[PDB]
Design a protein around this ligand. Structure first.
Ligand SMILES: [Zn+2]
Ligand SMILES: [Zn+2]
Length: 251
């Protein structure tokens, strides 16, 4: 959005997709990220000239970057500026460019970054790290680095925001008579008491066993949801107990 062709301009942004485990995301964590950015030659100090040589005033534009283009009218003179045949900038140290960056002041560096992942992130949350990402032009600023969280599934839990979700399979006997089960939690295990008579679908709410909130909130909750499993692959002693169960209870 500026007419000066050699105006300063910010470098390209970068994106890193970082893979987390279910729990890494629930809690905090930290990673070092290794990658190759374009950074700006340390070998030439940013000007693409063999050290001990120098950019020099242009052998056409005479230090202007532009060629005045003057045309005689009846009433006067027309001046058109067109950007220089050669330098397109200011100087012209092209006879001796830096060896590594082939003249443009930008070296492929190897870079590493220390990232605090705050507790509670979900897949697709981004973090902006200001300095990182690619080199600016004509002395402009450095790009930003953007990491997107990508969270791996759990074998036990589903999640959504602060809330954790666990399904409990109960058998008929446990459902009818009640029972006490150990319930997995991202914070460790928790004993839960199942009343006698539990209907399938029942939702139990464990307070503050869910995920920490990004926006300063208190920890969320883990909701346990009961599923009653019909039994299958039943031997004859088992089918007798049930037929005998049926009879006891229509008497
Ligand atoms: Zn260089
Ligand atoms: Zn020139």
């Amino acid at each position: 959005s500026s007419r000066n062709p050699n105006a300063p301009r910010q470098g390209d942004d970068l994106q890193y997709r970082v893979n987390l485990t279910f729990e890494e995301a629930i809690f905090g964590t930290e990673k070092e990220v290794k990658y190759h950015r374009e950074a700006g030659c340390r070998t030439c100090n940013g000007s693409g000239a063999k050290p001990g040589t120098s950019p020099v005033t242009c052998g056409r534009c005479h230090g202007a970057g532009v060629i005045n283009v003057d045309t005689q009218t009846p009433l006067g003179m027309m001046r058109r500026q067109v950007t220089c045949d050669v330098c397109h900038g200011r100087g012209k140290e092209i006879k001796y460019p830096c060896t590594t960056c082939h003249g443009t002041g930008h070296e492929k560096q190897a870079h590493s970054v220390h990232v605090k992942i705050p507790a509670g992130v979900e897949t697709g949350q981004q973090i902006r790290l200001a300095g990182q990402g690619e080199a600016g032009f004509n002395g402009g600023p450095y790009g930003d680095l953007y990491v997107v969280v990508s969270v791996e599934a759990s074998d036990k839990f589903e999640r959504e925001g602060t809330t954790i979700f666990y399904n409990l399979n109960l058998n008929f006997v446990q459902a009818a008579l009640g029972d006490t089960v150990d319930i997995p939690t991202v914070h460790g295990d928790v004993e839960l008491v199942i009343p006698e008579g539990t209907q399938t679908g029942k939702k139990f709410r464990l307070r503050s066993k869910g995920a920490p909130s990004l926006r300063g909130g208190a920890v969320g909750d883990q909701y346990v949801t009961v599923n009653v499993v019909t039994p299958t692959g039943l031997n004859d002693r088992q089918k007798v107990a049930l037929k005998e169960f049926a009879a006891a209870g229509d008497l």
